[PDB]
Amino acid sequence: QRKGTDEIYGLGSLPSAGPGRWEYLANPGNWHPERRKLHEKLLDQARSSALTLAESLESDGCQPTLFALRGNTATGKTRIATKKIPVLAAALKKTAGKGCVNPDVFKSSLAKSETGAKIFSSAQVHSESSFLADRFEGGLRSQKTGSGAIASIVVDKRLSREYEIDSYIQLAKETGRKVELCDIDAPLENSLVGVLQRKPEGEDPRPPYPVVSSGFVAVRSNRMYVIDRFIADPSLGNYRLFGTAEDGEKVMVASVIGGEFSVENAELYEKITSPQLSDLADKVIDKELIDRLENNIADPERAAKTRAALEKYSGKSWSAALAAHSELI
Amino acid sequence: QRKGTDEIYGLGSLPSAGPGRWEYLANPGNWHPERRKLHEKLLDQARSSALTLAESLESDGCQPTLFALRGNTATGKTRIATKKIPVLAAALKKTAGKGCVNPDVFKSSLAKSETGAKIFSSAQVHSESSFLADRFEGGLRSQKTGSGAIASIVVDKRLSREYEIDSYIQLAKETGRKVELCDIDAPLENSLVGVLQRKPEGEDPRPPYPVVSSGFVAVRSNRMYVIDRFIADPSLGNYRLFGTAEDGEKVMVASVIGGEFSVENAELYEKITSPQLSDLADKVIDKELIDRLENNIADPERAAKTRAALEKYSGKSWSAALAAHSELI
Amino acid sequence: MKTLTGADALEFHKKLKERNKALHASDLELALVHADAVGKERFDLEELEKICDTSDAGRLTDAKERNDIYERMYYVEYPNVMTLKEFAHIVETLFSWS
Amino acid sequence: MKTLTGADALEFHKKLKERNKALHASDLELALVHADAVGKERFDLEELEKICDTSDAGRLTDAKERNDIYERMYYVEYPNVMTLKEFAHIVETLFSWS
Incomplete structure (x- = not known):
């Protein structure tokens, strides 16, 4: 059955890629009316959440800002925001975390299709969810709050690649927003x-191994370029790398704050700016590996959850384990 | 009591370094007659062993050769010679391993001082033993066998540094010997x-951590220079890197054989030509580390000996453990 | 440890950029030599683009970034993938996720 | 894996030499920046030679090798050693052994 929802709910034939496929999806007449209406409903919800975030941020005196949480999958981004961006943490509590620009915001809703249960896989709904995230981000660009001020927004993607970084900097410049970037x-x-710990009944994505590994390589390789942008332009905003x-435990490694560049941990800075290409895909999860990972976790709850996640795939390679874990609905 | 034997058994005052201290030691009148006689006796033994090696090698049809076993402390050099240099393995069995040029050949004898028990530490006898190894190597340079042919010799030092490599190449060229080099x-x-497994009642040295770590850095950093010498000069001899x-298990990684250069394992070649500076001195030997090392040893006997060696220093850093292990007599 | 600041921070950053740039180039150069030795199919963007979208649905337009991304991933990250077809599989997977 | 031979082996070797040379230089450059930031005593061979023998009892005579060996060990291998005196200790240890 594994056609994507764009095929299932799209009317007529699907053009194949940009700018063919793209514009086809943008025209509502190209969808069954039920799907069209579901799109409208999800965007309304997402936009209301974002406005709530933006109003909280402005009331707390924050100038128009693009908060960007850069970093690979399951690196601890949610905890960093809670602990290290107090003004954003206050906004996020009001929306229970919703309202951020993220190509995965719409996935669970689209996968359930208002039927009350998940019937499409993450991969089946990805293109449709990314199409929606694009419409969502598009309308936030010039979104105003109740004072007519430009609305602050939160982007938590991987943001690995140079072209992604450049586009959000350009968005911020064009729309009068500071960039507040935490890179994790x-x-x-x-x-x-972290990915194996994400339960299928939860909302967080469960990508297979190559997504996580290629994401890791890209985030590391392109890290210093991002730092260079803040060093070069003190008015861009602020940068912190954890x-x-x-x-x-997360620790600050480097920062550009007030146009001032500092290296809080030079040993980590040297390490986390390169992909350290020595591979892990074939490494087998056995008692020793699990004991090794437990050995560096002191919190009882996390140690226990880490153990359970791994034991489930005992005897499997990292690749096979994330594959199996990803295929669960 | 920790003056070296050169001080204890040297007559008069000790000049401080080259070429002062050096030449003082070369003059037998500068030693107590008992020590002088002990020197003569140890050199006689070492020279008889070397001649036995050299005669075995010639009978087996080996042209005049400098066999050089390059590599850091306890890397498995003895096993490589036994398995991978069959003509040398046959010679060595006839001398039970004796006859090689090694700055540690004389240490145990000098530490016991014919008294029947070890009374000086390795460090107390080092300079004297190195002085003797130098006299021993000096006399091997133009040593002939019974056919008047130049005697083949074995040098098993670390041979890390460029100047060491150059000097042995020059020795071989000057004395008409091929260089047969295994680098381990x-x-x-x-x-x-490996060092923690060496028992004090055995003859192998028990150096402290910085010796082993600096030896590792030097052997790795200067490896490709050695390979370059064989690539550049097919008549130098042959090179194998394991x-x-x-x-x-040891595996061949690169070779220059018959002036022909090959890379049998390019992944290992990239790894073992650099010191991988990420440190280990402070790493604590605990249950996890021991379990990790046992996990990659399948031979029951070695697994057991490895475990016992490490358990003795459970809870200590690598540095503290090798320190304690080194200080045993 | 002590935080690097001012001139020292900037100089550490400069030298680290040089190191990583040298490693970046080296990883690819070595991968290419190895690829030629094992007969891995030569990377061809155009032909790859004729089984998958290398634009991120129009996000990545700079062709010199598009080339660098996939050529380098092909050689450096997937040295054991021998063919463009097989690598096709991988890229498809990557764009199925975020 | 497949053995690299002929032209490929030589080219792998050439590029690996370049990588390691770049890493060699980088390790020292970074160590120097860090050393200046923490106030580690400047390396001085002459003054070091005035507490220990840096010749291997006359083996190492090339002063440009003598400098490279100990300067680099001081900065790259013992970044936490702050003084020439303390490093003195270490070199003494190293020549007590083989």
């Missing part, structure tokens, strides 16, 4: 562990 | 484990 790094194995110590 | 690599942790797989 974890070892690849941490992301793999890396993960041996014990799992 | 192990991960640093392997050498550390590295250590994940399971502990």
Whole structure:
């Protein structure tokens, strides 16, 4: 059955890629009316959440800002925002985390299709969800709050690649927003562990291994380019890079704050700016690996959840385990 | 009491370094007659062993050769010679391993001082033993066998540094010997484990951590220079590099044989030509580390000996453990 | 440890950029030598683009970035993938996710 | 895996030499920046040679090798050693062994 929802609910034939496929999807007449209406409903919800965020941020005296949370999958981005961006943490509590620009915001809703249960896989709904995230981000560009001020917005994508970074900088410049960027790094194995801990009944995506590994390579390789942008332009906004110590705790590694560049942890800075190409896909999850990962987790709850996630795939390679874990609905 | 034997048994005051201290030691009148006689006796033994090696090698049809076993401490050099240099293995069995040029050949004898028990530390006898190794190597230079042919010799030092490599190449050229070089690599942790396994009642040295770590850095950093010498000069002799797989087995990584250069394992070649500066000195030997090292050893006997060596220093850093292990007499 | 600031921070950053740029170029150069030795199919963007979209649905337009991304991933990240077809599979997977 | 031979082996070797040379230089450059930031005593061979023998008892005579060996070990291998005195200790240890 594995055609994507864009095929199932699109009317007529699907043009194949930009700018063919793209514009076909933008025209509502190209969808069954039920899907069209579902699109309208999800965008309304997402836009209301974003406005709530933007109003909280303005009331707390924040000038128009693009908050960008850069970093690979499952690196600990949600916790960094809660702890290290107090004004955003206050906004997010009011929406229970909703309202951010993220190509995965619409996936669960689209996968359930208002039927009360998930019937499409993440991969089946991805293109449709990304199409929606694009419409959502498009309308936020010139979104105003109740004071007529430009609305602050939150983008939490991987933001690995140079062209992605450039586009959000250009968006911010064009729309009069500061860029407030936190860049969050974890070892690849941490992301793999983090992904295996995400339960199918939860909303967080469960990507297979190559997504996580290629995401890790890209985020590391293109990190210094991002830092260069803030060093070069003090008026861009502020940058903070957080890396993960041996014990799992996040620590600040480098920062550009007030146009001032500092390296809080030069050892980590050298490490987390390169992909360290030595591979992990074939490494087998066995007792030793699990014991090794437990050895560096002190929190009882996390240690227990980490263990359970891994034990489920005991004897499997990282690749096979994330594959199996990804295929669950 | 920790003056070296050169001080204790040297007559008069000790000049401080080259060429002062050096030449003082070369004059027998500068030693107590008992020590002088002990020197003569040890050199006689070492020279008889070397002649036995050289005669075995010639009878087996080996042209005048300098066999050089390059590599850091406890990397598995003895096993490589036994398995991978069959003509040398046959010579060595006839001398039970004796006869090689090695700055540690005389240490145990000098430490016991014919008293029947070890009373000086390795460090107390080092300079005297190195002085003797120098006299021993000096007399081998133009040593002939019974056919008047130049005697083949074995040098098993670390041979890390460029100047060391150059000097042995020059020795070989000057004395009409081929160079047959095996270069043996192990991960640093392997050498550390290997050193902790060496028992004080055995003859192999038990150096402290910085010796092993600096030896590892030097051997790796200067490896390609050595390979370059064989690539550049097919008549120099032959070169083989052996590295250590994940399971502990040695495998050939690169070779220059018959002036022909090949890379049998390019992944290992990239790895074992650099010191991988990420440190280990402070890493604590705990249950997890021991379990990790046991996990990659399948031979029951080695697994057991590895475990016992490490358990003795459970809770100590690598540095503290090798320090304590080194200080035993 | 002590935070690097001012001139030292900037100089650490400059030298680290040089190191990583040298490693970046080296990883690809070595991968290419190895690829030729094992007979891995030569990377061809145009032919790859004729089984998948290398634009991120129009996001990535700079062809010199498009080339660098996929050529380098093909050689450096998937040295054991031998053919453009097989790599096709991978890129498809990557764009099925975020 | 497949053995690299002929032209490919030589080219792998050439590029790997370049990579390692770039890493070699980089390790020292970064160590120097860090050393200046923490106030680690400037390396001085002459003054070091005035507490230990840097010749290997006359083996190492090439002063440009003598400098490279100890300067680099001081900065790259012992970044936490702050003084020439303390490093003195280390070199003494190294020549007590083989």
